[PDB]
Amino acid sequence: SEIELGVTEPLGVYDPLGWLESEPEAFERRRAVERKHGRVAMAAVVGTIVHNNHIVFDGYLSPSNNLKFSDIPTGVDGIRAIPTAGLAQILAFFALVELAWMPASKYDGDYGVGYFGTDIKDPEEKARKLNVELNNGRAAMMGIMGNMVAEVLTGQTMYEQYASGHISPF
Amino acid sequence: SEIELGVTEPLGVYDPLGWLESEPEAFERRRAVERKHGRVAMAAVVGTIVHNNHIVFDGYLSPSNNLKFSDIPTGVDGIRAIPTAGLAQILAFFALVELAWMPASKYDGDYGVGYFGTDIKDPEEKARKLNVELNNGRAAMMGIMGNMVAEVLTGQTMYEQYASGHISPF
Amino acid sequence: SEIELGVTEPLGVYDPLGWLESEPEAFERRRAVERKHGRVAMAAVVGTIVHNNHIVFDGYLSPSNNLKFSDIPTGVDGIRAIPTAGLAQILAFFALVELAWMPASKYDGDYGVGYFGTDIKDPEEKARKLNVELNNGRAAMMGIMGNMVAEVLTGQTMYEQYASGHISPF
Amino acid sequence: SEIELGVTEPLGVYDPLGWLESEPEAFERRRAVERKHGRVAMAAVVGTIVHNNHIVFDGYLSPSNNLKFSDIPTGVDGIRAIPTAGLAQILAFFALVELAWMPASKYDGDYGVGYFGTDIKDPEEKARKLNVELNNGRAAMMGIMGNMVAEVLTGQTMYEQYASGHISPF
Ligand code: KC2
Ligand code: KC2
Numbered sequence: 001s002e003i004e005l006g007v008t009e010p011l012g013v014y015d016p017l018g019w020l021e022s023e024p025e026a027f028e029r030r031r032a033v034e035r036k037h038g039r040v041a042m043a044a045v046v047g048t049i050v051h052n053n054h055i056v057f058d059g060y061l062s063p064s065n066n067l068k069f070s071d072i073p074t075g076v077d078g079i080r081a082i083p084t085a086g087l088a089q090i091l092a093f094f095a096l097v098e099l100a101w102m103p104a105s106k107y108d109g110d111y112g113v114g115y116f117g118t119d120i121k122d123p124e125e126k127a128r129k130l131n132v133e134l135n136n137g138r139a140a141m142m143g144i145m146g147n148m149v150a151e152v153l154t155g156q157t158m159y160e161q162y163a164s165g166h167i168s169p170f
Numbered sequence: 171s172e173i174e175l176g177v178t179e180p181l182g183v184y185d186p187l188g189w190l191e192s193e194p195e196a197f198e199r200r201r202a203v204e205r206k207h208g209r210v211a212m213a214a215v216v217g218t219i220v221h222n223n224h225i226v227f228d229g230y231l232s233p234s235n236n237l238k239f240s241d242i243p244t245g246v247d248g249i250r251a252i253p254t255a256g257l258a259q260i261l262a263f264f265a266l267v268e269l270a271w272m273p274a275s276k277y278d279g280d281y282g283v284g285y286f287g288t289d290i291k292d293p294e295e296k297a298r299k300l301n302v303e304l305n306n307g308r309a310a311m312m313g314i315m316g317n318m319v320a321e322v323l324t325g326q327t328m329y330e331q332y333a334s335g336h337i338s339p340f
Numbered sequence: 341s342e343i344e345l346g347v348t349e350p351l352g353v354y355d356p357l358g359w360l361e362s363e364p365e366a367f368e369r370r371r372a373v374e375r376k377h378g379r380v381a382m383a384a385v386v387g388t389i390v391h392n393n394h395i396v397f398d399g400y401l402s403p404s405n406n407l408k409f410s411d412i413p414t415g416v417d418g419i420r421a422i423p424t425a426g427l428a429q430i431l432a433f434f435a436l437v438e439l440a441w442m443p444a445s446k447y448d449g450d451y452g453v454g455y456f457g458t459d460i461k462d463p464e465e466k467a468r469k470l471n472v473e474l475n476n477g478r479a480a481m482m483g484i485m486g487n488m489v490a491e492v493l494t495g496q497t498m499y500e501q502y503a504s505g506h507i508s509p510f
Numbered sequence: 511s512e513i514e515l516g517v518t519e520p521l522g523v524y525d526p527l528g529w530l531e532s533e534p535e536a537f538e539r540r541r542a543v544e545r546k547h548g549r550v551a552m553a554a555v556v557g558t559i560v561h562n563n564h565i566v567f568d569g570y571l572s573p574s575n576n577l578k579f580s581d582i583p584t585g586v587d588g589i590r591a592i593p594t595a596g597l598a599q600i601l602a603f604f605a606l607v608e609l610a611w612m613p614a615s616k617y618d619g620d621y622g623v624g625y626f627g628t629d630i631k632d633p634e635e636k637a638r639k640l641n642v643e644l645n646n647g648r649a650a651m652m653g654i655m656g657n658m659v660a661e662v663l664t665g666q667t668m669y670e671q672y673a674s675g676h677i678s679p680f
């Protein structure tokens with residue numbers, strides 16, 4: 001029932017380059033990659049929205065570096081501002097996650113957590129929720145790409161872009 | 171089972187002008203219209219209650235127009251105070267909704283979201299919840315009409331009417 | 341299955357005066373009365389706890405009477421401090437409730453709202469929850485009686501009794 | 511199905527001492543003890559985390575002793591700081607719990623409250639949740655032991671240890 005997921009109006013089965021029938025055996029991992037990217041991009045978009053609203057922690061991210069949370073830029077440079085030891089800690093934690101707790105090798109993406117802890121018994125409701133996850137992931141992928149591109153070209157974070165009234169490109 | 175919905179005590183099947191039997195084929199769309207109006211009026215009544223409590227966003231609705239959120243009147247003139255571009259954006263978003271996401275042409279009103287996400291498996295509980303939705307929509311329709319009429323006849327918003335002790339018409 | 345409800349450890353079927361077998365036909369209304377009193381007393385105990393923590397509304401209960409919410413005593417005189425028109429409004433609203441929406445004549449006490457909106461499908465879980473409701477109602481009945489009696493005897497509300505260290509009767 | 515609980519990756523059935531087959535009849539109470547310790551240690555770890563974030567009640571724990579809540583140390587001396595009468599009250603309340611409401615003699619640890627009030631109908635989901643409870647209890651046991659040992663050896667509470675940058679032992 002996985003090959004039926006992600007087929008939603010108005011496009012239906014949208015395979016413009018025709019890879020569903022050309023490479024039928026690769027669809028499992030391609031959908032795994034699509035779902036992984038969708039989840040990551042949804043988290044990233046929520047993160048950007050939180051950042052540019054200046055919802056930051058109170059205190060120091062790295063007291064040894066004298067680096068407060070509010071000192072971290074809200075744009076694409078935020079991850080670069082983090083100290084190298086902090087990036088190492090993030091990488092170690094997500095190595096543990098991605099290799100043990102929710103392995104990326106599990107292509108169905110089903111790690112037992114369900115939707116808010118509970119399995120969706122109704123097949124129609126479960127299919128609709130899975131389609132919602134896929135479509136929101138696709139929208140978030142396009143959105144995070146657009147956010148990063150706009151920040152890189154305009155030169156301003158989303159907060160700075162909105163606060164200066166620079167919404168119109170022309 | 172749709173024709174049994176909305177039949178509740180103390181009125182039961184209340185058709186004073188006798189259109190259930192006179193026009194049996196029009197009931198589907200008439201109930202669709204009733205449910206749509208009920209949902210819209212419930213949202214409108216909650217909106218009026220929020221407005222007259224002065225629960226407003228902090229900032230500017232339209233910085234180019236120098237129009238803060240608190241500058242928008244809490245009465246029937248609130249929607250008129252919004253800039254034309256903002257009204258255009260609201261209209262475009264709801265055109266997308268009403269034509270694609272939750273089409274108004276779907277007369278059963280079932281867009282797959284269920285009641286707080288989950289389908290109601292028990293037929294009795296589902297019928298009770300649907301009757302609750304219909305009755306609350308009817309009450310909200312009457313309430314929003316009464317609120318608008320009282321504001322237009324007294325010249326005061328609900329907050330101004332209550333704060334001045336003008337809740338007695340005589 | 342109603343006659344099995346309220347039978348819980350350590351007392352089991354506790355009928356010290358032997359009215360379950362003496363008047364088997366009166367048990368339905370007696371359990372209705374017990375459940376009604378339990379619900380009312382649970383609400384009353386929560387109300388007293390809220391009052392004596394000075395969690396009060398901000399504003400005037402009756403601006404014509406120049407009576408603020410904080411002016412209402414938190415003890416047994418609180419309901420007496422309310423203006424007569426306010427008591428009339430409360431009585432009218434609860435007449436509507438108790439006669440139409442959740443009639444007191446419905447001895448099973450099942451008004452369709454369920455436990456947090458949902459019916460409890462598991463008979464064991466449902467029986468346990470009903471026993472919990474009954475036992476908490478009994479405890480709240482005893483508690484509200486004790487609170488009122490202690491306030492009347494000591495001359496102080498619960499807040500005044502606790503704040504003065506007058507908890508020990510001797 | 512209890513003997514299958516707690517068997518999780520990567521260790522599977524981890525019995526280095528070989529007591530599962532040496533003493534098959536003692537496993538019921540040993541798992542009861544393990545689950546009890548897991549729950550107690552999870553509560554203790556949450557408590558330590560709350561303490562060292564200085565999330566304390568506002569007021570006096572014991573006005574007669576002139577002992578505010580903020581005066582109670584956040585480390586291992588917190589339970590020693592509270593007055594003897596308060597310790598007696600805590601002990602009495604938990605005697606009532608552990609002997610009547612959720613008896614420790616019930617080795618299955620099933621007191622009818624379920625997981626957030628509801629029984630888990632799906633056997634796979636229920637087994638996963640029980641394994642989660644056991645593994646989190648084991649992790650919390652190790653964590654609370656480590657927290658207490660680190661505090662007793664460094665001489666500082668967790669807040670004092672973190673605030674001084676004394677996290678690195680060398
Ligand atoms: C991925 C999630 C994550 C987890 C689960 C996690 C857990 C723990 C634990 C418990 C096991 C401890 C004890 C601990 C301790 C410290 N952390 Mg964490 N930490 C995470 C992320 C980051 C990031 C992003 C940064 C960071 C930092 C520090 C500093 C530096 C203070 C200073 O330098 O004095 C110290 C002492 C910053 C950094 O090291 O900067 C040099 C920084 O940027 N940490 N950290
Ligand atoms: C229906 C819901 C809705 C959505 C989903 C939505 C999304 C976005 C997005 C993201 C796609 C952007 C980037 C964006 C941007 C701006 N909006 Mg929205 N907007 C919505 C509603 C309104 C309303 C009601 C108003 C309004 C306004 C502005 C202004 C004006 C600022 C200024 O003039 O400098 C700017 C820049 C106000 C207005 O245009 O007044 C002339 C105003 O009244 N918007 N808006």
Ligand code: KC2
Binds near residue numbers: 404405424425429431
């Ligand atoms: C039972 C729940 C309940 C409901 C559902 C409810 C609904 C409404 C509605 C909407 C239909 C209106 C329009 C309305 C209006 C007023 N109420 Mg309510 N009211 C309830 C309870 C009380 C209580 C307890 C009191 C009270 C009061 C007033 C005053 C007095 C202001 C003043 O005197 O200027 C006015 C104008 C106080 C009182 O009348 O004191 C003389 C007072 O004590 N109300 N009330």
Ligand code: KC2
Binds near residue numbers: 575599601603
């Ligand atoms: C285990 C949970 C628990 C419960 C369910 C519970 C219920 C009640 C009830 C309702 C039945 C009353 C009426 C009551 C009253 C007092 N309690 Mg509780 N109390 C609990 C725990 C503690 C702790 C830990 C302490 C404490 C205290 C006091 C004091 C002291 C004030 C003073 O000295 O002036 C008074 C009057 C402190 C203490 O006695 O210190 C000498 C203190 O440390 N209590 N307590």
